[model samples]
Target chain A: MVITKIVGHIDDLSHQIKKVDWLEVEWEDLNKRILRKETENGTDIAIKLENSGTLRYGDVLYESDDTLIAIRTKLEKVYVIKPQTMQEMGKMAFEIGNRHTMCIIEDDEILVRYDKTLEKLIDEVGVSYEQSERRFKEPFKY
Target chain B: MVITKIVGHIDDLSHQIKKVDWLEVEWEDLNKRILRKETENGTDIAIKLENSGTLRYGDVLYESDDTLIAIRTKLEKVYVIKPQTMQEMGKMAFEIGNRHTMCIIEDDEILVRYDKTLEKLIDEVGVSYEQSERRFKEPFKY
Candidate 1:
């Protein structure tokens, strides 16, 4: 089945009785227009939404009385840097942006895709960070 | 007198009996090695330091037991943006940097040279800010 428009998001839906099929995508591919996936039950799904809008986890691609299909992000390894203070955050963010590294702020920590240079930079700058698997909602980049 | 080197800064000096002559410089002209200025006493002072290092408000240009001369900075008007939280600081700094605007962080606030466009952007972003005079120590720019 093909979905040209979105019904809404999973969070926007209320408690309803229906089966859910997930179309998994990578964090980086959230903004991809050529979205194509299939469920284990041989259900073909393709979403060519208007304006090439980005998709996040729990985005309800299609919904009907029979079933609902939504988007899911695959687990991606990323480096997370936590700033101790507001001054640190500002300085760190500017430095990271200056270095041409893209990042996202979530849970009071800046998350960047796994990169050795970024890890080295975080270490050199003495910012607290660690590697972990996260479902990135989006990315903020230049 | 042409000064080829600097003694130190006024703050670094110890209390001693000496007259202090001031050579005022604008904040933007601090890094100028072609620096030439005359005091009220007609003391011809031209700072031709080799390194062309920037000068600060309390920079002691020349010092002696007989007399001491220091640099001074003229007052400057600036915009002070105070981030309420670290998250806000990071977002604001990244946004400002993306706009190709230079800024400095001092006294727990981000200071930028007065610009009407910046004021409008700050207002549009809803970051708390005000216009006031400040002595910018340095600027972080691209």
Candidate 2:
């Protein structure tokens, strides 16, 4: 079956999901245009997404009468730079962004794909950060 | 006299200043190689700076036995973006830096040269900012 767009997401869906399965996505493969994977229940499906934007965890791909097939992003290692103060945050973000890296901003910290030199740079500036494994939902923009 | 470098700054000076004179510098003219200007006391001086870092508001250029001729930066118009939280600061800084503009970080805010689009962008992002005349000192680094 062809899915026109992402009808809903697990995070903000009102539908009472009687059953649900996940279509796993990697951290870097979020930009894949074609998706062919087996759900958690070993159900093979061929899907084509046109205008649903970059896939993320909990995106509803196909919703049947009962079963729901959704996109789930796989966790990957990343450096979560935590800034305790606004100055640190501003400085860190500007410095990191200047390096032309895709950054995902969270509640109080920013995430970047792990890099050896990045760790050294962050430590040199005395910003608090740690390696972590977490879900990257939504698209990275701005 | 040929002043080799910036000897000291007012913010960190140990020698007791008996007599002081001001040497004004414009914002854009900080890169001028030859400086021939009169001090506030109207002392026509022809001096040269070779090894000193970018002239700031308090750089002591020629320190004689009893008098000190220092550099003072001229205040110009700027937009000071004040972020209330770490998230706001990170987002704003990343956005501004992505635009490839020179930003000077202050105690709690970041300063950028006045631009119509920058002001509109700051407002669109709901970041707090106000245009104020402030000194551009110590060269914009990082």
Candidate 3:
């Protein structure tokens, strides 16, 4: 709550971090410097990241003698497209970009935020996909 | 350009809000008070919303004699779930919530961000889904 500075991280081996609770944030909330959030355990928190890099899903944000604050990848309902060929991937990406859809590239797979009306076009094109919760990364923006 | 305040909106009757250009923002950028963005016409803009509401698609943010700045819904890829029964929808929502996935409820439809590995479970549970691009709203986060 009210995180001002990045005191330490999970990767920092020197700090004796005691993990007491976690903060689950979506990709959008992660980018802000100040936010109000509730932990998984129903605790209200206000977070302020004075200086932060593009946050990853498991990055640790705070630490203290009795507790540790870390970032948890908030589950996002998304459409994940797994292209079997490079050409297919390129074609899908191009079409998606033309429509200005925010496409996320993660580990050779393509991810999109969910919309109800566009699924028919994708299904008609013979591309396969799945619907579920995911850890969304930042999309390339213009 | 620089946005000093929210002068008026598109629906305001008094102001002649001339549409000059539009800036497409993802759900993440919509929540911030200050940000940098470029319009489709390649104009660099620095936006600062002094007072604003939870921004919706097509919400006008700035207005001047010669210009009107508005928010465009950025398209996103997502999973759209159509449940056959109320019980099925409830079960799916519970499962998604248990996994901490951000599930979106839009007009009686259940939508989720896409996950590459989640199709099987949804299929097993007799849920139908399609993959496609959609304008994503802010997810329910706590």
What does DockQ come to for candidate 3? 0.01
Answer with 2 or 3, whichever has the higher DockQ. 2
* lDDT (Cα, tens digit) per residue for candidate 2, span A6-80: 877787646555588777766555666576777777777565766647666677878889878887777788888
Q: Return the lDDT, model 3, position A105.
A: 53
Q: Which digits, one per residue and each the tens of the lDDT, describe model 1 over residues B1-119?
A: 89877787766445745777878677666667677888655788988888846656677788778777887765689999987767667777767766767788553588888998777
Error of 3 at B29 (Å): 39
DockQ of each: 0.45, 0.63, 0.01
Which residue window of length 10 is worst by lDDT in model 3 chain B? Answer: B85-94
lDDT of 3 by residue, B1-142 (tens): 6875655445542554475567887666756768788887677877766675555555665666777777665787888877554444544444554455655655435667778777876786577788988876653433
Weakest ten-residue segment in model 1 chain A by summed lDDT: A133-142
DockQ of 2: 0.63
Please list, in the order the candidates appear, how each scores on TM-score for chain B only: 0.79, 0.77, 0.74
Query: By DockQ, highest first, what's the ranking?
Result: 2, 1, 3
The candidates' interface RMSDs, in order, read 2.0, 1.3, 16.3
Local distance difference test scores for all models? 0.73, 0.75, 0.62
**Highest TM-score: which candidate?**
2
lDDT of 3 by residue, A1-142 (tens): 5666665556552554565477887676656667778777666777666565555545566655777676655677888876564434433443454455665655446678887665874675456788878777552332
